């Protein structure tokens, strides 16, 4: 992302929606739901807060933090070796190698019995109130406004209170701005393009940045002169 | 005699159907 994620409170979207006389019955209760829906449907990683938190494994199982939504990586606390997805179907079940993990709910199923693991996970930036906190990027705000507008007009059109042309125009505008926001939050910055360039041009390829925490994904690959 | 509690709503419904017919022909064109 070229731009920065300056955070603002949720009713900044209701500043903008309620200009429209047909969206005057929207509330913070509706804003919260549709904003979470938009955050998830877009799936932009720059909107989440990067956090690292260590837990202990009792026996191939560990308690997971409360605010976790996705896991960037899991590693062993003492070695630093990263973990992979567990393809095994019989992990903690005995009969009569390289470590791995799996996460479903509040439980993480590792292949280690008793060890501490570091989890780099993503969460949502919250407000002083326990509510989501949205970027103030006007592209993001306009796209979220159009999302909420499109949902409300879909309801009104199912009722027959909106002309079909109106809903078609709203959907068209929302689709274009959804593409625009997706590209805005995804296209690399200049500093990120240096990382991508250092990853791309490698006379001797580096294919083991997963073992580390992708620390050296972006380091330059310096060849000595002979 | 006189009472318009049934004729008024029927006239309003007729004009609502005309409203929906009029706005159902509205198109935002393409291919420019």
Quick check: helix, strand or coil at residue A212?
coil
Cβ distance A168 to B26 less than 8 Å, yes or no, reads: no
SS3 A225: coil
Q: At what angle do helices A138-159 and A28-42 cross, to 10 degrees?
A: 110
Structure tokens at B8: 């008024």
Distance between CA atoms of A142 and B23, rounded to whole angstroms?
A: 27
**Would you call B26 and A169 a contact, using CB atoms and an 8 Å cutoff?**
no
Q: Phi and psi of A116, rounded to 5°?
A: -100, 135
* Tokens found for residue A151: 């949902």
Q: Is A70 on the interface with B (CB under 8 A)?
A: no
Indicate which technique resolved this structure: cryo-EM
A175 touches chain B (CB under 8 A): no
Token digits of residue A41: 């449907």
> Nearest to residue A100, comparing CAs of A127, A75, A119, A121?
A75
Say if the Cβ atoms of B28 and A163 lie within 8 Å.
no
Tokens coding A171: 């959907």
- What whole-number distance in Å separates Cα of residue A77 and Cα of residue B30? 60
Contact A124, A65 (CB under 8 A): no
List, as one string, the DSSP characters of A71-130: EEEEEETTT-PBPEE---SSTT-------EE-BSSSEE--S-SS-EEEEEEEEE-B-SSS
Q: CA A81, CA A211: separation in Å to the nearest integer?
A: 5
Pairing of strands A7-9, A100-101: unpaired
Are the C-beta atoms of residues A142 and A177 closer than 8 Å to each other? Answer: yes
Name the burial class of residue A142, with classes exposed (0-12), middle (13-18) and buried (19+) by CB atoms within 10 angstroms of its CB. Answer: middle
User: Could you tell me which chain A residue has the CA closest to the CA of B27?
Assistant: A165
Contacts of A160 in chain B (CB under 8 A): 20
Nearest CA to A177 out of A79, A38, A57, A70 is that of A38
Cα–Cα distance for residue pair A65/A52, rounded to 1 Å:
10
**How many C-beta atoms surround the C-beta of residue A91 within 10 A?**
14
Give yes or no for A169 touching B (CB within 8 A).
yes
| Residues in chain A within 8 Å Cβ distance of B21 | none
Q: Nearest residue of B to residue A160 by CA position?
A: B20
Residues A168, B28: C-beta atoms closer than 8 Å: yes
B28 lies within 8 A of chain A by CB:
yes
Cβ pair A165, B26 in contact under 8 A: yes
Tokens 């070229």 belong to which residue? A2
Task: Count interface pairs A-B at CB distance under 8 A.
Answer: 11
**Cβ atoms of A153 and A164 closer than 8 Å:** no
Question: Which residue of B23, B24, B28 is in closest CB contact with A169?
Answer: B28
The Cα of A161 is separated from the nearest Cα of chain B by a number of Å equal to 10
Whole-angstrom distance, CA of residue A100 vs CA of residue A86: 5
């Amino acid at each position: 992302m070229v731009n920065n994620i300056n955070w603002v409170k949720l009713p900044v979207i209701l500043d903008r929606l309620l200009r429209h006389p047909l969206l005057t019955d929207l509330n913070l209760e509706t804003a919260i739901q549709y904003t979470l829906d938009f955050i998830s449907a877009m799936g932009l990683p720059n909107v989440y807060v990067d956090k690292i938190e260590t837990i202990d494994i009792k026996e191939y199982r560990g308690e997971l933090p409360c605010d976790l939504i996705s896991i960037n990586q899991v590693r062993l606390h003492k070695n630093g070796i990263a973990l992979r997805a567990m393809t095994d179907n019989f992990n903690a079940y005995p009969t009569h190698g390289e470590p791995s993990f799996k996460t479903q709910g509040r439980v993480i199923f590792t292949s280690i019995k008793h060890e501490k693991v570091d989890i780099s996970y993503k969460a949502i930036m919250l407000d002083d109130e326990g509510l989501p906190l949205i970027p103030d990027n006007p592209i993001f705000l306009k796209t979220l406004e159009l999302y909420i507008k499109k949902e409300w007009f879909t309801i009104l059109f199912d009722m027959g209170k909106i002309s079909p042309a109106v809903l078609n125009n709203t959907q068209q505008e929302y689709a274009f701005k959804a593409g625009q926001c997706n590209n805005e939050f995804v296209i690399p910055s200049v500093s990120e393009m240096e990382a991508i360039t250092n990853m791309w041009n490698q006379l001797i390829p580096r294919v083991t940045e997963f073992r580390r925490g992708f620390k050296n994904l972006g380091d330059k690959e310096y060849i000595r002169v002979h | 005699f006189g009472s318009g509690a049934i004729g008024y709503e029927f006239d309003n419904r007729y004009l609502n159907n005309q409203e929906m017919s009029a706005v159902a022909k509205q198109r935002l064109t393409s291919l420019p």
